[PDB]
Amino acid sequence: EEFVEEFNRLKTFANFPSGSPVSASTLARAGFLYTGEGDTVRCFSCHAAVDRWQYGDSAVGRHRKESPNCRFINGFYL
Ligand code: NA
Ligand SMILES: [Zn+2]
């Protein structure tokens, strides 16, 4: 696990495609790690995978959409 620390999540985005409409910093902030494939990220807590990021997307907004009862998005790491 170890990924409760925000910098520890951002470390997983080594080869994340440079031209993405949502940045690696924002996705790490919204609880996601990188799977290493396409634009697919998975939550460290709830294990939900989200891909196909578009312009004007909320990282956090989509994470709550896929996982309304996620520990991280409901504040159980602050
Ligand atoms: Na999904
Ligand atoms: Zn989650």
CATH number at residue 4: 1.10.1170.10
Phi-psi region of 26 (alpha: psi -120 to 50; beta: other; left: phi over 0): alpha
In the 3-class helix/strand/coil scheme, how is 4-47 assigned residue by residue?
A: CCHHHHHCCCCCCCCCCCCCHHHHHHCCEEECCCCCCEEECCCC
**Method in brief:** X-ray
Nearest to 4 by CA among 27, 40, 28: 28
Angle ∠(36,1,75) on CA atoms, nearest 5:
100
Resolution for this PDB entry, in angstroms? 2.3
Residue 37 backbone dihedrals phi, psi, to 5 degrees: -125, 125
Q: Which two tokens stand for residue 22?
A: 């949502």
Which residues form the domain of 43?
1-78
Q: How many whole angstroms from 15 Cα to the centroid of ligand 2?
A: 22
Query: Looking at the 3D structure of the chain, how many domains does it have?
Result: 1
Cβ atoms within 10 Å of 27's Cβ, excluding its own: 25
Cα distance between residue 4 and residue 37, in whole Å: 22
Q: How many whole angstroms from 19 Cα to the centroid of ligand 2?
A: 24
Q: Which ligand has the shortest distance to the CA of 69? A: 2
